[PDB]
Amino acid sequence: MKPEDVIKEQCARAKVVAELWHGFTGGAPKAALENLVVEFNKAQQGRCVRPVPQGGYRDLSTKIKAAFAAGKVPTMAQAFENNIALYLEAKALLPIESLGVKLQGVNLTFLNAVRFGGVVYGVPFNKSIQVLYYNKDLLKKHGVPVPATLEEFVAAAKKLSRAEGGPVYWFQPDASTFAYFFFNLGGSYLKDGKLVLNSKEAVEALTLLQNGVKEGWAKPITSGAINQNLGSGPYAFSVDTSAGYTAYLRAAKFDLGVATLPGRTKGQPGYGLVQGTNLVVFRQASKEEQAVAKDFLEFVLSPRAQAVFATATGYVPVTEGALKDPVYQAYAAENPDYATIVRQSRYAKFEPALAEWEQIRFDILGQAIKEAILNKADPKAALDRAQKLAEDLLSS
Numbered sequence: 001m002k003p004e005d006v007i008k009e010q011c012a013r014a015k016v017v018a019e020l021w022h023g024f025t026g027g028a029p030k031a032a033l034e035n036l037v038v039e040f041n042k043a044q045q046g047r048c049v050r051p052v053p054q055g056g057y058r059d060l061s062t063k064i065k066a067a068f069a070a071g072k073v074p075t076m077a078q079a080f081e082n083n084i085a086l087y088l089e090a091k092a093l094l095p096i097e098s099l100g101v102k103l104q105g106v107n108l109t110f111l112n113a114v115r116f117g118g119v120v121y122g123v124p125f126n127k128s129i130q131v132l133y134y135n136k137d138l139l140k141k142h143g144v145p146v147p148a149t150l151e152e153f154v155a156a157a158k159k160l161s162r163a164e165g166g167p168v169y170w171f172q173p174d175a176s177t178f179a180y181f182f183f184n185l186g187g188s189y190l191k192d193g194k195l196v197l198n199s200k201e202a203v204e205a206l207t208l209l210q211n212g213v214k215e216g217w218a219k220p221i222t223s224g225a226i227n228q229n230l231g232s233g234p235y236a237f238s239v240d241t242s243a244g245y246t247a248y249l250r251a252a253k254f255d256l257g258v259a260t261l262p263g264r265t266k267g268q269p270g271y272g273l274v275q276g277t278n279l280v281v282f283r284q285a286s287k288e289e290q291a292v293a294k295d296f297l298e299f300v301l302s303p304r305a306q307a308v309f310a311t312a313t314g315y316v317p318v319t320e321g322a323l324k325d326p327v328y329q330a331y332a333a334e335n336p337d338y339a340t341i342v343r344q345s346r347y348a349k350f351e352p353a354l355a356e357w358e359q360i361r362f363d364i365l366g367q368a369i370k371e372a373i374l375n376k377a378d379p380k381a382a383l384d385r386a387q388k389l390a391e392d393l394l395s396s
């Protein structure tokens with residue numbers, strides 16, 4: 001009796017059913033969402049949510065565009081900030097505060113990100129922050145302090161790779177990893193309102209990674225998640241989503257470290273990329289489905305729902321209330337990595353919220369990073385190409 005079995009039964013006897021389309025394909029996010037929905041549905045009187053997996057996040061946005069085309073949309077769905085921008089062009093989204101959902105206490109880092117022209121269009125739900133995952137045992141073995149600066153991080157990666165005979169910093173050659181180096185070398189994607197992929201800081205970020213590959217301290221991972229490659233050769237450090245925390249804990253055969261990210265100086269942690277999603281409510285949904293979404297959105301913002309969800313996953317509890325819940329506190333008191341994730345969430349950057357950003361981050365910027373890392377393309381020539389494809393798509 002999988003939670004999804006329970007839910008299908010709950011929905012089969014419900015008077016009213018609001019679909020929630022998501023992009024959790026498995027593991028702890030998928031288990032945590034479904035357990036939340038089972039609990040919500042037991043409380044309700046013939047009024048249920050039905051989570052519908054749509055694949056990953058891009059499958060989900062593709063399926064949502066086909067839904068507008070078909071005229072069959074869900075009540076709710078997961079959405080990045082760029083997805084929200086897109087669906088607003090379509091006039092598809094219900095303003096949240098119209099349902100009377102109370103948003104005070106939601107972290108302004110996340111609340112600001114769902115606000116378009118003053119209006120909130122999303123409920124921050126599963127929001128993650130990059131952290132530094134590390135191998136405590138391997139750093140102790142070579143007397144390496146947890147690096148607090150980008151300088152110390154390069155140094156440690158070179159020191160440990162020399163000692164162990166192989167690259168100890170592991171990375172996915174993607175926009176998400178790029179963003180960490182880009183932000184903390186003083187990059188910004190927007191200059192005088194214009195999207196710029198090929199700035200000096202972008203070239204310096206992509207150069208740093210490619211030189212790490214050439215020098216033997218950076219290891220590109222091209223098959224599975226980082227946590228799925230552990231046990232193959234020496235590992236000291238990744239920069240990865242907090243939402244992988246439970247997966248790291250399960251897979252690591254070594255004592256797993258979580259730290260705040262290396263910054264430019266010791267005066268502050270580096271910035272982590274905010275990932276994960278918001279829940280949106282579609283205007284096309286029935287008044288009755290909307291009422292279910294309003295109770296569901298209130299439930300998901302409750303201290304207990306956030307304390308259970310965040311502690312099952314490593315996602316960042318989106319409310320001040322969740323940190324004051326005793327189930328959170330019990331987990332935090334036993335595992336310092338939960339406070340570490342919250343501390344890192346204070347130092348948080350977003351990618352641009354342009355309608356076209358999902359296509360750019362994957363098919364243009366992501367590609368130019370793969371070209372440099374995996375095919376030895378010159379970092380500037382790869383980014384100049386990206387900039388030109390992005391300027392051509394935005395002109396379309």
Ligand SMILES: Nc1nc2c(ncn2[C@@H]2O[C@H](COP(=O)(O)O[C@H]3[C@@H](O)[C@H](n4ccc(=O)[nH]c4=O)O[C@@H]3CO)[C@H]3CC(O)(O)C[C@H]32)c(=O)[nH]1
Binds near residue numbers: 023027
């Ligand atoms: N479509 C679309 N995706 C976007 C956008 N901005 C960023 N991202 C993607 O968000 C993922 C991070 O979202 P987050 O919820 O923090 O983490 C994910 C999973 O990463 C994480 N997980 C699961 C199993 C595992 O072994 N390891 C693990 O880390 O669990 C969560 C739910 O699956 C990155 C991954 C990416 O697909 O390569 C590209 C990134 C965008 O605009 N659009």
Ligand SMILES: [Cl-]
Binds near residue numbers: 025026027
């Ligand atoms: Cl699974």
